[PDB]
Structure formats: C-alpha cells, structure tokens
Write a protein that binds this ligand. Structure first.
Ligand code: HHG
Length: 110
C-alpha cells in the first residue's frame, strides 16, 4: 500500500484542502480517499496511463469554504472524466495531466 497527498499545479485546485490522503492497495487494488471532512472509495479503471474513477464521496456540511468546495467538486468530476497519470523512475511522485496541462501532482506520504 502507498499513500499520497496532492500538490495543486493548476489554479482551479489552489483551494483544495491539505488533508486529503489518497491510498492504493496493490494486493486488492483498492483506492480510497480520506480526510477530516471527506471520504471516498473508488470504483475505477487504470489502463495505458489513463485513470478514471468514481469515489462515491461523503462531505460534511459547512466544513469547507465555498472556494474549497468548488475545488473539491471539480477534482472529483475531473477524476471521473479521466486523467493521465505520469509516474517516474526516480521516486513515487505522479503528475496528473488533462487537456494539455499538469493539473496537480501526487507526492508520496502523509
Ligand atoms: C488524486 C489522484 C487520483 C488517485 C489515483 C491514485 O492515487 O492512483 C495510484 C495508482 O493506481 C498507482 O499506480 P502507479 O504507481 O503505477 O501509477
């Protein structure tokens, strides 16, 4: 099992909250997200660098600023529509790419 947090690259994501943690279990192929005010378990596909997933999200009312909510909504919508994941052979950082730009990066660890 590996975990990552997001560092936003695109401005649509500058208000994303910092405590979202993304987990991937290699044994059982499970992908979850966890945080104080959000959780989700992914139904997903990942083929040829293309990731698409539905996280079945739960969100705590009133916990987020309007700006955070919009960023969070956009994030899950984008992950549903599909993104390209770019890993590397140096470390476990992964770029999330869509529509010609890097949208965010996944950095290993809490
Ligand atoms: C916020 C980004 C969506 C979460 C998707 C995710 O963390 O995927 C992990 C991926 O399956 C690991 O495979 P890789 O190490 O071969 O790239």
């Amino acid at each position: 099992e590996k975990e990552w947090h997001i560092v936003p690259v695109s401005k649509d994501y500058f208000s994303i909250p910092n405590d979202l943690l993304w987990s991937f279990n290699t044994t059982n192929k499970s992908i979850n997200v966890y945080s104080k005010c959000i959780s989700g378990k992914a139904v997903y596909s990942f083929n040829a660098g293309k990731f698409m997933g539905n996280f079945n999200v739960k969100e705590v009312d009133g916990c987020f600023m309007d700006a955070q909510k919009i960023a969070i909504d956009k994030l899950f919508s984008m992950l549903k529509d599909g993104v390209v994941l770019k890993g590397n052979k140096i470390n476990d950082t992964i770029l999330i790419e869509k529509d010609g730009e890097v949208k965010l990066k996944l950095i290993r660890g809490i």
